[PDB]
Amino acid sequence: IVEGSDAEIGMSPWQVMLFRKSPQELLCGASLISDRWVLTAAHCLLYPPWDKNFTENDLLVRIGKHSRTRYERNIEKISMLEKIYIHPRYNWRENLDRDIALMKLKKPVAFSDYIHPVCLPDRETAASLLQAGYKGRVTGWGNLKETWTANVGKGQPSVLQVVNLPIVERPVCKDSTRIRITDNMFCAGYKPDEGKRGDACEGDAGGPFVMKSPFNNRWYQMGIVSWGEGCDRDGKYGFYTHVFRLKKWIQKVIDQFGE
Amino acid sequence: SEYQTFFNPRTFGSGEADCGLRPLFEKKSLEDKTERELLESYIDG
Ligand SMILES: *[C@H]1O[C@H](CO)[C@@H](O)[C@H](O)[C@H]1NC(C)=O
Ligand code: NA
Secondary structure, rough: EEEOOOOOOOOOOOOEEEEEEOOOOOEEEEOOOOEEEEEOOHHHHHHHHHHOOOOOHHHHEEOOOOEEEOOOOOOOOOEEEEEEEEEOOOOOOOOOOOEEEEEEOOOOOOOOOOOOOEEEEOHHHHHHHOOOOOOOEEEEOOOOOOOOOOOOOOOOOOEOEEEEEEEEEHHHHHHHHOOOOOOOOOEEEEEEHHHOEOOOOOOOOOOEEEEOOOOOOEEEEEEEEEOOOOOOOOOOOEEEEOOOOOHHHHHHHHHHOOO | OOOOOOOOHHOOOOOOOOOOOOOOOHHHOOOOOOOOHHOOOOOOO
C-alpha cells in the first residue's frame, strides 16, 4: 500500500496472509469469508511466467495478524489448505480477466477479536455502493513504493497498511490505459488534480477492497486487489476484481466442494 | 442489521450470520479512525 497508514488493531479482522512454504515468503493477501473459506486473486496462485503454479501443499495462510514479520503469540493462526479453486475462465495466457480464486482450509479457524469474516454483497448493496466517487478501503502488507535501495531504503511495511480510495468512472478507467478492461474489473484512486493520493502495490494482490453498508452497518467486500501500472502514478488507477459479478461462481464452488 | 443469508452452513461453514461486524468496533459500538470518511461519501440521488 502506497501513501496509506498503519491499521488499527482488529480494524480488518478478515485480513489473510498467503504464504509460500519453501522458500518461506509472503506471496499475496486474501480475505476470510467463513470459518473455512478464503478468497484471493487467481494470478496469486497461477501465473507460470512469474514463478507461480502452486498446489494446496505448497501454501499456508496466516490469519489474525498485524505485524508483517513478528510472530504474534496466541493471536495469529496458521491454516493449511485442503483444496484450491481457480475460476475456469481465468486464462493467464491472455489477460487477468476473472482474477479470482477460492481456498478451502483443511480445518475451520476459530474466531476471536482479531479473526472474523467479511460479508459478500447482495445485488442491492452492489447497486447502491458501486458508484463513482464513493470510497472504499484497501488493506495489505504489500510494498510501500515501486522501488527502493535494498537494506538501506525501506519498501516493506512493519505492520498492516490501510488506505481509503474513491471508485472511478469506467470511462475514466478505460482512457487511463491501453490495457483492455472488462466488466469483471473496476478501478479506484484519486484523480491527478485532487492532491490526495494512495494505491495498492506489489504484494497486495488478493487483498480486499471493502465498503461499509450505511444500511445494516456491515462491512462488504466489493473487490479484490488485482493489478495496476506502477504504483500511485498520476493519471493511473488501481484495478480490482468485481466480486459481485462473479458471485455465482463462488456459490457454485461452495455447495459443490464445501462438504 | 437486516442481513440476508446467502450460503448453506453445511458447505460454507460457520460465520455468515455475523459477517462484517467487527468484535473491536461495531460489536462494541466503537468507530475506527477513518470509517466516517467512507460513510460520508455514500450520498446518492
Ligand atoms: C505450472 O508449471 C509450468 C511452469 O512451472 C507451467 O508452464 C504449467 O502451465 C503449469 N503446470 C505444469 C507443471 O505444466
Ligand atoms: Na493514480
